[PDB]
Write a protein that binds this ligand. Structure first.
Ligand SMILES: Nc1nc2c(ncn2[C@@H]2O[C@H](COP(=O)(O)OP(=O)(O)CP(=O)(O)O)[C@@H](O)[C@H]2O)c(=O)[nH]1
Ligand SMILES: Nc1nc2c(ncn2[C@@H]2O[C@H](COP(=O)(O)OP(=O)(O)CP(=O)(O)O)[C@@H](O)[C@H]2O)c(=O)[nH]1
Ligand SMILES: [Mg+2]
Ligand SMILES: [Mg+2]
Lengths: 734, 747
């Protein structure tokens, strides 16, 4: 009984035992041998054909003893007389009540406290002549059906033969020699030793002399039919058996190797000899799984709760791993980074450092109200005093109103970073700290620290944008005033006199749509014209390398398109009266404007360049009797603010550009200095000492009852593994 | 000890046996042999000796019977035992038999549990036994033990099958009661060799050693495995009883008290036990006898039915009365007479098909083989012409005659027809010689009686030899008459009928004397050289030249009738230069007229050799075709059907024409006298030699056989037929006695 505790400890910490097959002729006593090897009386036994269907018994180990089937599901038979009745009922259900057979195995599974995980196979007897309603080929049918079970390797064969008939008539011996010629896996059993004729004995058979078998024969005595009808229990049967073997004159010296107990001993011996050569791997596996627990149960081994040393050591190392994990998840130190999400709080936070600019773009880019209000500013800072020059206090007043609305996105950003940071800590305390009252208080302290620092960061952001409403410098990379638009070719490139083709063409560049285009050029397109008070060029792209032809400015005219055309999009044509120099009028050389102010702006650019106005009476003063005091002009079309409005608007857009980029670049730094790094150094150099201050500190870091039961079950598995290794050592000692 | 049923069955079966044997036929009772089968240590030999009743077979634990035993019980007066390999020694104590038989068994097979298929023959002679054969056989096993070869069960099963697979073998399927019935190997064998269960007796042994709490009632009530003959349970001596040497009376007493005291077998105690088994086997033997009797009975009926046909003539027999002798005369004479009628006259029945002869065929062939040696034997030509000439110039030898004289014809035909004397006599002798052989052939089947073949043959042969002289005289006189008168008013042609001779006997008939033509005078092959399309090509045709016309044929069937070509008013020339005529070619033409006819440039006829050319030119000159003289161009008027071939060159007396006339008349008269003799001589010998012999053989023969004596010494044995008679008589009486014995047994 060393494999018994081996197996039960394999069950407590949670073998390929060779199955057992009993073979023999009809009425040899196979089922009695089998159930005496199990230990309990539950198999059909009687005269004539009884076991007419293969039975596959799977003994396994458990804490209580009962039986179950694979067709009577759920029901756990606890009395075995019901098991026997169920067996015979199922057998009569399939095979019928006329001595038929069937190769369809019956599957049992019997649970018992001290058994092996075997597979005992009871098989029908071997018959010669078919009786009842059996088909005429019944011998081959039964023999094939049991050869389908025996010819496998690692199948022990109990060859059961009665002692009434001679040994040379046995069928089990023929089967055993046909499938096992060497006898590596054959145990010979001789039953019915009490019915032999008066004057004979099986002495020459039990001494392994008549037919030599490698492992010899075991003589057993079961219960007779009157003993089965008389309900003779197992104890009295074994007592009578031993009485017989100690009383019989021809067997009195072989009494210590005959009987049922010796048969059970020999089968245990065979099984134990078969499981060794598996002990190396079987031991190595559970040794390897014991290494994974021995590192842990050094701490569970001895307490004795309410000890200061263990609790303080736990506080220290838990705080250590929490701090390490926090700096690891924010700054992203190695190793073993997460590759399924972005991060805990690193990338999700840097995405808000560079999605905040999308919050600055959504607002506002408005409106015509801007133009109207800067006009009112120009008028009001000229309240009673009038005229030149363009005052700059209007600029300082407008840009202090357009950046004033930047307080809203900036503050928003902080809140996002807060809702995203206060979550990262919750992500690194929901899985590390299983101690109750230690994860919640840890979260409380850290989150209060973050809530305290968000106030400082908000005050700093308020101060930051309040600074940009103080000075409003103009020495930055924006252009100096009176430089609209793109003045002046980098200070005229240090040359303006001899340069006929030295960028004297560049004064006002802009897109203008041509309606009529000839066949050789292409189709309708909006070209990039470079207008000068003296010349004009046209480009198709930005490389500034077209320079095909130079279009004039002087002595040129302008007219409108015919009625009915969709001028919105106002299109104006150029012409000449004396000469045909337009040049290359496409019937007609027309240019389109997209808005309404653009038409007047380009008309004024032409009027300052030297182009005559679009008056209806100007045609009679086409190129003869010109400049008659400019009776058509009223001095002027738009005095004198539309140009001032445009100049202030350009200056404001440039200053907004640079202030947007500076807030966009500077606020991430200012929440990284006052919130992130300060939280980090707090979580490093203050979390422990501040954590030692709150609570009664006695009932801090307790169970956590799940941890308690987790500890108990790991400790019991540790003891189970040590016991199993001790048993394997004992079983290799032999 | 028994047995008693056998002592009561032996007398009637012994009487039946010696009745079936003393009747001499290959008839036997063939009592079935008893073969006992089973597995090892099923209790077989005990059952066998319980059937016999004497203790002489080995038995015990383990393997005992290792060689088959063929026990032949033989009925005799002196009881003893003998072996085949111990000839000359008689055993009286059976203990000696058992000891020496186990000595033999372990002497041949060894002492290490070996077997051998060589049986041990044993004969027990006793006044209380039948002539049975009891075959004790080893029990079959499955695994070889000791020194047995690995195929022990196969060779044991062959040892059994060479004994149980023969027909009419009782099989005692012995099975123990300890084992289940479905493990009985004896029943497997019985189902393999006897599927209907006609001859299988099921026996159950070792009933007293069954497991406590069970019983074999479901088996013995013939309920578990249904067997046609049923089961019988026996209880034998145990191993301790044999070691205790228990006698038979106590064993049977224990058997009976066991079957009576058992609570499950008390109502079967009459059909259980060893005596009941003994009774059942004896009943099986008796059933076999009474079941095989009807076949032998109707077989003896069918056999005696054949002998009765001949016994009916042999019902009364009282040697040696003249009644049987006179009946034998009438039988043999009448058989011989109808046989002689069968051989010649060709009356029924059962004419000889295998032999072409026969007397009628040989004989009436020699009637039409004789006319072959009338034409063949005698012959003369080209010399009788001279004799006719001298007769013409001698019978009117003083004065010349102005007529053709007749004595010349008479003397020539008289000199020639007397040459027929020899063939007729030879034919008569040859017919005698073959008929006298037929009469000896038709008395070889008469050899059942000696000294009667000789008398029959002597009488008949002397009769033929007494008649041969008479018929030779008659034939001589018949051919002699033909020389007397020599009439010329017969159907032959009268003188001066053919002029010119002869037109081939007037076209060989009288109907075609006008329809046919005279184109046939000289037949021969002749080659035509130039031939048109319609006639054929260069070819040699068959010309038939006539003194009047010319015919040409391409075959012999004579159905063309193409054209009749002229002879008179014709010419002849030879070919132009350059040709080698050897092989000479001749052309026919005319100068006055252009009648050729149909010249194919040109009409040429070719001949092969030199005699052919000159012979056909001679035929042209004899017919009247103009010669090839130098005046060939001037043949206009000076020729007038030339040829200079009237009778002969140049002048001889008129004896040629008269000799030709005499020759024609002589040949015609010889033809008609040959018709007369060929048709009349066979009639002569059928009337004087055969029909008279037949009348003698049907009428006067019996009186001549009966006249000579003695009547007793004339007919006798020939002891072979007498022995046949006695054998038939023994068969008759023996078969009736056998029918009587069977009739006695049936009731
Ligand atoms: N007297 C006696 N009987 C025994 C002994 N051993 C077994 N038996 C009897 O033999 C009978 C058959 O036993 P069992 O094991 O059921 O045979 P089985 O092999 O199951 C028949 P199958 O399997 O072919 O259906 C039983 O009635 C049993 O009592 C014995 O030692 N002594
Ligand atoms: N108690 C008892 N023993 C029997 C009975 N029948 C046979 N035996 C015992 O069986 C033993 C051998 O029996 P036997 O008849 O010789 O079997 P066998 O077939 O001849 C052995 P072999 O194969 O050599 O022929 C003997 O000891 C005999 O006493 C029986 O009815 N009752
Ligand atoms: Mg069973
Ligand atoms: Mg024997």
């Amino acid at each position: 009984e060393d494999l018994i505790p081996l197996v039960n400890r394999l069950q407590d910490a949670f073998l390929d035992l060779p199955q057992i097959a009993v073979v023999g002729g009809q009425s040899a006593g196979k089922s009695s041998v089998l159930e005496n090897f199990v230990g309990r009386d539950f198999l059909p036994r009687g005269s004539g054909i009884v076991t007419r269907r293969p039975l596959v018994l799977q003994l396994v180990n458990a804490t209580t003893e009962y039986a179950e089937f694979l067709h009577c599901k759920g029901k756990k038979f606890t009395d075995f007389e019901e098991v026997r009745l169920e067996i015979e009922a199922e057998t009569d259900r399939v095979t019928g009540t006329n001595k038929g057979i069937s190769p369809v195995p019956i599957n049992l599974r019997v649970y018992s406290p001290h058994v092996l995980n075997l597979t005992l196979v009871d098989l029908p007897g071997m018959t010669k002549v078919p009786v009842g309603d059996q088909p005429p080929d019944i011998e081959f049918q039964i023999r094939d059906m049991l050869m389908q079970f025996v010819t496998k390797e690692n199948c022990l064969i109990l060859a059961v033969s009665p002692a009434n008939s001679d040994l040379a008539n046995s069928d089990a011996l023929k089967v055993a020699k046909e499938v096992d010629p060497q006898g590596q896996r054959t145990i010979g059993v001789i039953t019915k030793l009490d019915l032999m004729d008066e004057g004979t004995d099986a002495r020459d058979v039990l001494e392994n002399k008549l037919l030599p078998l490698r492992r010899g024969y075991i003589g057993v005595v079961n219960r007779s039919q009157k003993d089965i009808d008389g309900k003779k229990d197992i104890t009295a049967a074994l007592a009578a058996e031993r009485k017989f073997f100690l009383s019989h004159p021809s067997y009195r010296h072989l009494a210590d190797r005959m009987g049922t107990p010796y048969l059970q001993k020999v089968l245990n011996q065979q099984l134990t000899n078969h499981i060794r050569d598996t002990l190396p791997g079987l031991r190595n596996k559970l040794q390897s799984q014991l290494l994974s627990i021995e590192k842990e149960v050094e701490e569970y081994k001895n307490f004795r709760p309410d000890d200061p040393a263990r609790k303080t050591k736990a506080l220290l190392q838990m705080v250590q791993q929490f701090a390490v994990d926090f700096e690891k998840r924010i700054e992203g130190s190695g190793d073993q980074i997460d590759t399924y999400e972005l991060s805990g709080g690193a990338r999700i936070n840097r995405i808000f450092h560079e999605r905040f600019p999308f919050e600055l773009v959504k607002m506002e880019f408005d409106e015509k109200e801007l133009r109207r209000e800067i006009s009112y500013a120009i008028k009001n800072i000229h309240g009673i005093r009038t005229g030149l020059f363009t005052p700059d206090m209007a600029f300082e007043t407008i840009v202090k109103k357009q950046v004033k609305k930047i307080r809203e996105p900036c503050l928003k950003c902080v809140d996002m970073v807060i809702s995203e940071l206060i979550s990262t800590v919750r992500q690194c305390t929901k899985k590390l700290q299983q101690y109750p009252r230690l994860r919640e208080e840890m979260e409380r302290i850290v989150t209060t620290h973050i809530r305290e620092r968000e106030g400082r960061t908000k005050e700093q952001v308020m101060l930051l944008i309040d600074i940009e409403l103080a000075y409003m410098n103009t020495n930055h990379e924006d252009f100096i005033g009176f430089a609209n638009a793109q003045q002046r070719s980098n200070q005229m490139n240090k040359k303006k006199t001899s340069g006929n083709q030295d960028e004297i063409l560049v004064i006002r560049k802009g897109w203008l749509t041509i309606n009529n285009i000839g066949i050789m050029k292409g189709g309708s397109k909006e070209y990039w014209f470079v207008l000068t008070a003296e010349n004009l060029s046209w480009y198709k792209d930005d490389e500034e390398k077209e320079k095909k032809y130079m279009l004039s400015v002087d002595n040129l005219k302008l007219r409108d398109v015919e009625k009915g055309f969709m001028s919105s999009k106002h299109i104006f044509a150029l012409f000449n009266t004396e000469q045909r120099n337009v040049y290359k009028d496409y019937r007609q050389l027309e240019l389109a404007c997209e808005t309404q102010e653009e038409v007047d702006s380009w008309k004024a650019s032409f009027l300052r360049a030297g182009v005559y106005p679009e008056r209806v009476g100007d045609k009679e003063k086409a190129s003869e009797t010109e400049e008659n005091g400019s009776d058509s002009f009223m001095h002027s079309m738009d005095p004198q603010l539309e140009r001032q409005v445009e100049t202030i608007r350009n200056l404001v857009d440039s200053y907004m550009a640079i202030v947007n980029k500076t807030v966009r670049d500077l606020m991430p730094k200012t929440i990284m200095h006052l919130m992130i790094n300060n939280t980090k150094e707090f979580i490093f150099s203050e979390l422990l000492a501040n954590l030692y201050s709150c609570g009664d500190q006695n009932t801090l870091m307790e169970e956590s009852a799940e941890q308690a039961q987790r500890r108990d079950e790991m400790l019991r598995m540790y003891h189970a593994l040590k016991e199993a290794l001790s048993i394997i050592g004992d079983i290799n000692t032999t």
